[PDB]
Amino acid sequence: RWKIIESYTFLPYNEKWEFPRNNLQFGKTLGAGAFGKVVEATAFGLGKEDAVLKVAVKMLAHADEKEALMSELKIMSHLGQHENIVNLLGACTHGGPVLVITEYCCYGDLLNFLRRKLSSRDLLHFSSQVAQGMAFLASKNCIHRDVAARNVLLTNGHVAKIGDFGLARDIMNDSNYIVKGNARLPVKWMAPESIFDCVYTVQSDVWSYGILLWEIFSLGLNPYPGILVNSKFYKLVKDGYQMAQPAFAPKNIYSIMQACWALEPTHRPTFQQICSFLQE
Ligand SMILES: Cc1nc(NC(=O)NC(=O)C(C)(C)C)ccc1Oc1ccnc(-c2cnn(C)c2)c1
Ligand SMILES: [Cl-]
Ligand SMILES: [Cl-]
Ligand SMILES: [Cl-]
Ligand SMILES: [Cl-]
Ligand code: NA
């Protein structure tokens, strides 16, 4: 999951976020997992706004699991709002199981959407909005660690936000998640230093961000097409193999991909720089 690294960093729950669970009628299950699901719902009056906005609710495994949902909610209250990010609206932590309420994204995940099918204006759009999201997480020294297309959601306007299905994601049955000890990690999206040296930074998320780019401009090809994950693979990234340019990337964008896939973390760009190169 997404952790807070050491701009400048300075975590108990704030009861301001609290919401009467009494004002929620659930809908269809939007996704489900090894310890959790996520569901359509409607919220009867959150904020003097006093709306009836449609929302997603996450929910739960023993107290080993409780811990991490609260920690999740903690993190999401430390960061505060941003438009290209899935925003915490509220929570119900009393009178029942923990419920975490977030914004809703009608069009769902970017990977399925890209497969279901849109212009190279729209890819530049998607690419720029997610860049705005990570740049925001980066600025709070928040790392994500599963930056992939499947975890980009499309909301009102087909506008992109980064979230994380996390608990509500069937990792166990997803072959994009290889085994490694207790954990199961998205190896094809990981910077080398994370695979080999278990080190994870903002600059690590940049590696993953370059993969997202390869997805976006392949319209949802699984990365390293046909290449299995085993002895040969790890060597190729240690050697410094790189995916070829995808079909619909203007060469400019492929250079962005290659920047991100620099081996020494300290020579990859930042989300701000990426954000700024997309301004032009
Ligand atoms: C995906 C997803 N992510 C998050 N993540 C989250 O809060 N993240 C963060 O805080 C970080 C710091 C990692 C950015 C939370 C919930 C969630 O669940 C949704 C949300 C909206 N919409 C659908 C949905 C699914 N299908 N449809 C049609 C809508 C599913
Ligand atoms: Cl109680
Ligand atoms: Cl935007
Ligand atoms: Cl796939
Ligand atoms: Cl070109
Ligand atoms: Na798996």
Rounded to an integer, what distance in angstroms lies between the CA atom of residue 198 and that of residue 143?
14
Rounded to an integer, what distance in angstroms lies between the CA atom of residue 220 and that of residue 108?
14
Instruction: Give the number of the atom of ligand 1 that is nearest the alpha carbon of residue 106.
Output: 28
CB atoms within 10 A of CB 75: 17
Q: How far away, in angstroms, is 119 Cα from ligand 3 center?
A: 16
Length of the chain: 280
Dihedral pair phi/psi, residue 79, rounded to 5°: -75, -35
**CA proximity to 252, closest of 128, 163, 97, 112:** 128
Q: How was this structure determined?
A: X-ray
Rounded to an integer, what distance in angstroms lies between the CA atom of residue 129 and that of residue 116?
21
Ligand nearest to the CA of 220: 4
Print burial letters for 224-239: b (CB count within 10 Å at least 16), e (below 16): beeeeeeeebeeebee
259 is in an annotated binding site: no
**CA proximity to 206, closest of 150, 108, 273:** 273
For residue 223, give both structure tokens. 């990365």
- CA of 259: how far to CAs of 7, 24, 61, 203, in Å? 22, 46, 41, 11
Reduced to 3 states, what is the DSSP secondary structure of residue 235? helix
What is the torsional sign of CA 108, 113, 115, 116?
positive
| Rounded to 5°, angle at Cα 251 from 153 and 160 | 10
24 is in an annotated binding site: no
Dihedral pair phi/psi, residue 27, rounded to 5°: -125, -140
CB atoms within 10 A of CB 115: 12
Rounded to an integer, what distance in angstroms lies between the CA atom of residue 141 and that of residue 127?
21
Q: How far away, in angstroms, is 15 Cα from ligand 2 center?
A: 13
What is the torsional sign of CA 99, 103, 104, 109?
negative
- CA of 79: how far to CAs of 86, 142, 180, in Å? 11, 8, 30
Residue 140 is given by DSSP the state: T
Q: Is 239 a catalytic residue?
A: no
For residue 177, the number of C-alpha atoms closer than 13 Å in the C-beta half-sphere is: 16
Dihedral pair phi/psi, residue 26, rounded to 5°: -65, 160
Question: What are the CB-based long-range contacts (under 8 Å, 24+) for 14-21?
Answer: 14/77, 17/73, 17/77, 17/88, 17/90, 17/91, 18/90, 18/91, 18/92, 18/93, 18/94, 19/43, 19/46, 19/90, 19/91, 19/92, 19/101, 20/92, 21/92, 21/95, 21/96, 21/99
- Give the DSSP H or E segment for 42: strand 37-43
One-letter amino acid for residue 164 of the chain: D
One-letter amino acid for residue 268 of the chain: R
The greatest distance separating any two alpha carbons of the chain, rounded to the nearest whole angstrom, comes to 58
User: For the chain, how many helices (H) and strands (E)?
Assistant: 8, 10
| Rounded to 5°, angle at Cα 179 from 178 and 185 | 55
Q: Which residue has the tokens 């032009």?
A: 280
Q: Provide the edge-to-edge strand list for the sheet that holds 152-155.
A: 108-109, 152-155, 159-162
36 is in an annotated binding site: yes
One-letter amino acid for residue 228 of the chain: L
Q: How far away, in angstroms, is 224 Cα from ligand 4 center?
A: 11
Ligand 1 residue neighbourhood (C-beta within 6 Å): 2, 30-31, 38, 56, 58, 76, 85-86, 102, 104-105, 108, 137, 142, 144, 153, 162-165
Question: What are the CB-based long-range contacts (under 8 Å, 24+) for 215-218?
Answer: 215/110, 215/111, 215/114, 215/148, 215/149, 216/110, 216/114, 216/123, 216/126, 216/127, 216/149, 217/123, 217/246, 217/247, 217/248, 217/249, 217/253, 218/246, 218/247, 218/248
